Amino acid sequence: METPLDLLKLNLDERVYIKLRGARTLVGTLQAFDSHCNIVLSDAVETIYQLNNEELSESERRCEMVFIRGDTVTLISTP
């Protein structure tokens, strides 16, 4: 019932899924955020969707700790 941010605050220390505009999605364990949707992830694994010569391909990276700037964020939900 609280603003969508509060629901996002419900997910702290949990695995979150974050969607970015540029055909990239992340799933990881959320540690912090502000109202601009800037985010710190603690054990995320990124996955990138591409267009290569009429085939869909998906490479992925993982890292221990990453700040991610909010203005790229298009959606959030549980893994």
Partner: protein, 77 residues
């Protein structure tokens, strides 16, 4: 205050929220941050039309960026 009045009485209805990416999310509207951040339960994902390939279905609450919302509409049908 017609717009704020609109978000009030649409809490709980099923809607279509299309982003600037052209992506379209449907399910039940319960947040309306007023930066027009939206939270939806039972959200489905289609590219531009309900008639297209289901790209993703969500089984928990979805959070959507207000800066990216193009429109919100009831999915009466």
């Amino acid at each position: 205050s017609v717009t704020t009045e609109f978000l009030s009485d649409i809490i709980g209805k099923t809607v279509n929220v299309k982003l600037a990416s052209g992506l379209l999310y449907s399910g039940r509207l319960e947040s309306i941050d007023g930066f027009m951040n939206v939270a939806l339960s039972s959200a489905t994902e289609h590219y531009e039309s309900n008639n297209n390939k289901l790209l993703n279905k969500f089984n928990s609450d979805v959070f959507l960026r207000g800066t990216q919302v193009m429109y919100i509409s009831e999915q009466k049908i």
